[PDB]
From Swiss-Prot:
Like erythrocyte spectrin, the spectrin-like proteins are capable of forming dimers which can further associate to tetramers. Interacts with ACP1. The chain holds residues 970 to 1024 of 2477 of the full protein. Residues 1-55 form the SH3 domain. Morphologically, spectrin-like proteins appear to be related to spectrin, showing a flexible rod-like structure. They can bind actin but seem to differ in their calmodulin-binding activity. In nonerythroid tissues, spectrins, in association with some other proteins, may play an important role in membrane organization. It comes from Gallus gallus. It is found in: Cytoplasm, Cytoskeleton; Cytoplasm, Cell cortex. This is Spectrin alpha chain, non-erythrocytic 1. The gene is SPTAN1.
Length: 55
C-alpha cells in the first residue's frame, strides 16, 4: 500500500528514516498506532504514523 507524506520528517533514531512532504512511500507495517514502517529513499524504517496518509 502507498502513503503520502503530509510533512517533512528527519530521522532521529537508528530505526527511523527521512521523508519530504509530498513523497509517496510504500507502507510496510502499520501495526503500531504511532510509528509506521515505510520505504523511503531506498531505506526502510519508521516515521510517525500521523505524518502520513494512506492512499
Amino acid at each position: 500500500e502507498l502513503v503520502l507524506a503530509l510533512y517533512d520528517y528527519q530521522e532521529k533514531s537508528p530505526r527511523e528514516v527521512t521523508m519530504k512532504k509530498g513523497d509517496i512511500l510504500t507502507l510496510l507495517n502499520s501495526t503500531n498506532k504511532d510509528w509506521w514502517k515505510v520505504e523511503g529513499n531506498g531505506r526502510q524504517g519508521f516515521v510517525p504514523a500521523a505524518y502520513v496518509k494512506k492512499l
